[model samples]
Target: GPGDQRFGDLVFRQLAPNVWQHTSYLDMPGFGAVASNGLIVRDGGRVLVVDTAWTDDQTAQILNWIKQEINLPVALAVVTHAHQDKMGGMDALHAAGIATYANALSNQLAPQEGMVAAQHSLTFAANGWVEPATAPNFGPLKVFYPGPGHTSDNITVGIDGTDIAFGGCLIKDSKAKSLGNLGDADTEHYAASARAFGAAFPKASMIVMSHSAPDSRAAITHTARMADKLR
Candidate 1:
């Protein structure tokens, strides 16, 4: 496996042979420096991304690096939820001719939450909103919505060969003892949501949370506890 790499403000650190934790920053008006994370996977010569960066400029940097340096084109970009940190680069992805997938609920609620749904989307709702939830495979990666924690539409991605889970906002970093942000969370069911999340991807040895560094399954424990406390 290759070592950690950086392009501009974006950093890609390999956690598994196929999985890399990609980190970048977004300077919000009042939030100082906010860190953001997503996943990049090398499925043969093509790339599969779990989430987009906070803006099109940042997302463009990531895609550009993959094309120029990595010599790979992103085949798929899946949005974990409606938050900007996950799907804010929809326009960029669409412009690049990359296919985008998202849960149906996320597609429905994204506009309501002030986020734009991807140009090409699908339904992965586990709550029986339409069909049953599925662990859809994108090349070597599996996408699932175990339940909801950070948001009702949050989903996690599991790399089949790597055993790394991109938990997005449904799980927290070990250092983040609390659940982090709750602006659009489902507090009453957060604990249950996290518990189900753990059960869904039990083989995920290393999990990457949306805005924090990667951690072991202990991240799920911390998030579940915080959810109970908040409940």
Candidate 2:
């Protein structure tokens, strides 16, 4: 019953019951066209989105598809990091009147990446850890900050009722052969961050990552192993 649904350049693939992996592509100079992944989580008649497409237009299309196809109101959206692949469509989300959330550090760094900051801040403590406790209407979605890895402000979102975790750019896919962009990475703490992420969502059987296909919980371990080599 799980299959792919396309909306022009955007594609939504069912990952589990009521959970889909939404992917959009970006044209890079050297890499040609690269795909970025996010999540569309549905609970009853409402939905929650994680990350956005690489551009506002693409994200607008995603909103349109949700409105016309899913036929449910997006209760909230969480941008996992300050990168373009994560929060690039912030304007579209805001225009759609969706409550958008990003880490406080992400809000501060978003402009630096040429992207708009999320409307609401998901605060983190001194040790760079915090779990969102609000939004009881969005079902059992858990947003956790497990220090810094791919980016200082990167966070992970786990759907509580399922074995799905949207790792954004923090947790790489199993097939990832490189560490990815290091422009804003905390290289020194990368491994620790990956480990923290794994510990936070040990039951995540399916891990969705940006720029790659969804993989198993082993993706977290693979990421930690990759980061360990860096140190």
Candidate 3:
């Protein structure tokens, strides 16, 4: 809601009481065709988003969810990594005056990072990949480049004063019986990053991934064990 309004296709739906998912699975032909993603934790009085959708249509949907669901003022919009799915809506969010961030390497390698993002959009043949409404204003968003997996700059988000962590494209979905697709990956480092993410939350049971269900430690351990066989 962010006190801005847009008449959009209804895409924001409830996931958790405080959490909402705006399925970016629009019928559009460009970049974000198959992305069914959402925002997990915004500051109780401030909001911090994970990835922004590819189009303003989807962006408006997410904004609507925040307005309808929580009293939290949106403070930051974190593009967990630089992939199109993760960073596409930065311009829209930035225009709304929300701060934005991606992994540090994304800034250093932004040009290629953008190409990497566009490569995914090419999948939609121009039906996807729209220019952002505003260039994002950088601010502090904790990013530990545990190393490349989904992409070279993939990172995670841990909510302040809470247990939620947006594990980027890492972490198998607790609700999904399988792990995240390493279609864009560097297996060696990614595995290590996954472990580091788990270690970062020694006692934490739940973590959210870009494309899966929120999961528990046991679920992570189980998935790791299973993947070891193929490794």
Candidate 4:
């Protein structure tokens, strides 16, 4: 069975065929050291990185691991939102000449939130800016703006050939008791955002939250429950 493999400080766990959760930790200001997860999706000889680690070094390590273990060329990198844990390692990815992409709003707000922006911006596909597209293709992933919860510009990605969803910090991890970190979150809009996101991807079998363990769709339910509690 395809399973987990450790590379340096990163843990790559296979959740489905050609889909893995690449996790790495970062020293957050108040949270001390916390883990962040990204998706490593291999399609044929090309690979797509859904999110990035918390630092350039951490990002570089994952890149090496991708090349070493999977032997596929990383052709695309997508930033799910404007948080440090997801976009901080962007510089390393850019330096390595990998094309990077993200929501335009996420890109614009990233620096304001004290995080760097990706090299490319993805405009909403033929709809309102905040509305989600039925299917927007970016390399091998279908990216969509599932509204904004954890941050004002968060987005989610679905695997091309699977039901895996990369929710970034928008969806809480399985064991997450609260909305992990809401520093830049829109609290009043959090629940609504989560609801809209879920409605958009009703068929997702796996939801990869940024800082959770054992990836599962329970992450979505957990966030929804927490949101309900808040109201």
Candidate 5:
């Protein structure tokens, strides 16, 4: 895929042949680099993104890619869970006429931790959140939640053609020095959540977490093996 030399103030990385990561750093020109991950999945003929970046500025980096690399707007976006890092630029995405998706609790519980989370992003992480490009589905991304390890709304992506399960932020291995900050999730449910992921994707050979690069299912098993030694 082709890309631009610069866009406003962000840098977009092409992680895969068609996958692009729009990113930024604080005070950096482009946009929401505040702990964000954006994925564009083409379902049917339209593009479905997993989440929007925190700020439109950073998202623009993605938009620039879509315009150059991809050929459609974000048809749908599923918030992996209830975190500003995942859904801050909803407003910008929505205005661009993109459809958004999230778990029911994501919308209902938003005001609780979700609201505070969104606000804190502004104060500390950076005000990258925007209104939805449109409203969200208001339900978990399908059979992907209460996997209960992380925030309860985390959804791992599955490409119908490939046997890959793109685990959002939940299945971090013990070696994953950091696992997308579980501040909002119950530590008690961590193991169960991870185990559930294994059960859900028994046939999956490759796994993609938000943090580290994609790896084999063996990574998770090895992560379990090294758990006690992680600390």
Candidate 6:
């Protein structure tokens, strides 16, 4: 039924079996409040989260929810990029003793964004593909760095055995009117990155994006088109 459960400024909504979308808000200077999205994937009695909310406090709420409501221990967390929306909760995650992973570049860049670096580094092949072998524990999640769109270290996580693909901020929702933030974007490669992310998950019926509602595979094309206009 895709029911939503709220906790303060965060909302955890079920997307598919064992897959929930967590959203938190950030108050921007001129943009008012902006919503950022991440994914919480559960397997058995453990859970793995992709990306964190916009602040450490918000991220703590996530941990609290998992323990209180979901009653599962978070085994791992992966930040898709170095941005605040993705890794702002690094401090909280670390305090909880949860191992957090991020691309080498993301780990290096997170400090510059005023966020704590992830505990572990995820190394990708030349083709930007890396799959963690945490199958029965949390995920056999596919982490792909499609050459960066939203940021230089932006990555996407695809949940195996499910139709969900967490695009972070790399892939936009269909309703996005513009590329949300180009401050740290690789505009020249944005279109290609979006296309690559889409190609990486051809059957992803649900593309969970940050700052917007989940959309279909076509959101990939929509993002590419928006990036094209920038070029």
lDDT of each: 0.79, 0.85, 0.55, 0.79, 0.54, 0.85
Q: Estimate each model's TM-score.
A: 0.90, 0.94, 0.68, 0.88, 0.70, 0.94
Model 4, range 32-59, lDDT digits (tens) per residue?
Answer: 8787888888886788888889889999
Which 10-residue window in model 6 sums to the lowest lDDT? Answer: 131-140
**All candidates in order of lDDT, best leading:** 6, 2, 1, 4, 3, 5
For residues 62-136, could you state the per-residue lDDT of candidate 5 as single tens digits? 666677756765556666666665665666666676655665556656666543222211110112122223333
Residue-wise lDDT of candidate 6 within 23-136, one digit each (tens)? 999898977988899988888678889898989999999998888878888999989999888998899998999998888889898778887899888887778787454222
Model 4 earns a TM-score of: 0.88
Off by over 4 Å in 1: 1-3, 29-31, 125-137
lDDT by residue (tens digit), candidate 1, 1-231: 555788888988877766677787888797798988998888877898889998888898888877875678787888889988898888888889988888877988988878879765556553522232333337677667777679888877777777687788888876685676788888998899888778877888888888877889988888888889877
Residue 197, model 5: Cα distance from true site in angstroms:
1.4
Q: How far is candidate 3 from the true structure (C-alpha RMSD, Å)?
A: 9.2
Prediction 6 global C-alpha lDDT: 0.85
Summarize candidate 3's per-residue lDDT along 132-182 as a digit string, tens digits. 332232222233444455566666655444455556676666445655556
lDDT of 6 at 203: 86
Worst 10 residues of 1 by lDDT: 128-137
Tens digits of per-residue lDDT for model 2 on 9-54?
8998888778888899988897799999988888878988999999
- Residue 229 accuracy (lDDT) in model 5: 38
Runs in model 5 deviating more than 4 A are 1-35, 114-143, 178-180, 222-231
Q: Residue 6 deviation, candidate 4, in Å?
A: 1.8
Q: Tell me the number of clashing residue pairs for each predicted model.
A: 0, 0, 8, 0, 22, 0
Best by lDDT: 6
